[PDB]
Nucleic acid binder design. Structure first.
Ligand SMILES: [Zn+2]
Ligand SMILES: [Zn+2]
Ligand SMILES: [Zn+2]
Length: 87
DNA sequence: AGCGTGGGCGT
DNA sequence: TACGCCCACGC
């Protein structure tokens, strides 16, 4: 089962790993340790900060295998690729 | 479309 | 524990 439960009285979510609960607590504490150097916006997660910066830089590492169109995030590419399916 | 952001991991 | 993938869900 999931032994790590959120100690917040209003929350009843559970987790299987320690660090996942630790990350979840930041939702309640509102902790946002990672800041964008460009627009000074704060983020709760380092990886989400990385993808956010691409909105400023215009970096798009992920290209569609079918047409070559580039995207800032991998899930953006995945959502796109399926449109080449014409049933 | 553009993108915030939590969840579920693997390392 | 932190780091950073994929993956979802949502607007
Ligand atoms: Zn909670
Ligand atoms: Zn920014
Ligand atoms: Zn394409």
């Amino acid at each position: 089962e999931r032994p790590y439960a959120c100690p917040v009285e209003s929350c009843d979510r559970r987790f299987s790993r320690s660090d996942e609960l630790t990350r979840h607590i930041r939702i309640h504490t509102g902790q946002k340790p990672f800041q964008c150097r460009i627009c000074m916006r704060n983020f709760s997660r380092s990886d989400h900060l990385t993808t956010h910066i691409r909105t400023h830089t215009g970096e798009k590492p992920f290209a569609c295998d079918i047409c070559g169109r580039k995207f800032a995030r991998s899930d953006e590419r995945k959502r796109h690729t399926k449109i080449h399916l014409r049933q």
